[model samples]
Target: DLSSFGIREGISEIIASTGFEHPNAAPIGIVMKGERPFVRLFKGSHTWENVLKEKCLASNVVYDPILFVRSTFSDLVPSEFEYVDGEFKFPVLKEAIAWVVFECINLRNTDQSLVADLVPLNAGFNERNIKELPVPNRGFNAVLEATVHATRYQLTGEEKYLELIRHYESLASKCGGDAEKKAMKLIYEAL
Candidate 1:
């Protein structure tokens, strides 16, 4: 699991370095791909365990701010330069957020067995949302939605995934900038 790839240590380093102190820090974004459903399931479960044990708190969370910034400069910045500019920090944070979202959705859903199930409706929504937005890469949103859907499906078996789908879909649309309207819109849409 990418979660176990010293992600916590990397995040700690980023936090300790105060990399996010920059006003122009990147925003985190989610992406999904093959097998991400299962990955998300595991992440979600682990996050729940941590939360229930008081090892983590949901309020201290922030989504892919770093990734959003990194993506903007991916083409312009060299890989090494990107790394120096805090590109890696976003992915670590993203992985954690994916896990947490998966858990929250899972809790909302009563059925844990459906964690890996991918509803066509949800897939269609994801497809449409991805197509509509000019998101950096499919990977970020794919993993993110995969985690969210895992939770949504686990919680509500009805496959009424549009609500959450729209929520994140909108986030995938305007993920940059910290302007009041943009920030508020991003937050509101994310819910």
Candidate 2:
């Protein structure tokens, strides 16, 4: 993910962390055009707010279901990250298997979306531990799908997402690795 934005391959999800005095994290979609990666946030969203305020964001290749689930509903996770710049207070998830620090290069506005063009400055990863890294698992990716669905459920109070969640749950139980199964179970328990 560091060398290219492979978002076109599937529904890619990654954590975008802000450089606030109190840092924040949220799961966001990644889209690739040509060779660049792009992310769009709803105006006034926490990520958008932080990007506008700080002019920087990080794409964290984290694989934690708890972290993913938590960030969606809250502001920050105190112990989930470490900083490299004390002066700027820049952040990358300590739990990320790979990390990409993106400086917001451009902002093109639409009606409500703030689409950001990013330039990668410094990035690294725990290569051997990416867990088939971006592949589907009952754990991280499945929960991620559910996370998005769960968000929709919150907004519309629709039972449709519940059905989707159950679908992921079933997939996790059927094909998830041990970790995937565990995370899927955790998501079920949390919801």
On TM-score, the leading prediction is 2
Winning model by lDDT: 2
TM-score of each model, paired residue for residue: 0.22, 0.80
- Superposed Cα RMSD, model 1: 17.2
88-132 per-residue lDDT for model 2 (tens digits): 557877777777777886788878899887777666665654555
Q: Candidate 1 residues 1-191, lDDT tens each?
A: 33322123122111101121221222222223443322122334333343333221111122343433232222212221111111222111322222222222222233552132111110001122122333464434433553445345556764576566555545545553343223333333343
What's the lDDT for residue 152 in model 1?
A: 59
Candidate 1, which segments miss by more than 4 Å at Cα? 1-44, 47-150, 175-191
Q: What's the lDDT for candidate 2?
A: 0.72
lDDT against true structure, model 1: 0.29
Clashing pairs in 2: 139-180
For candidate 2, the TM-score is: 0.80
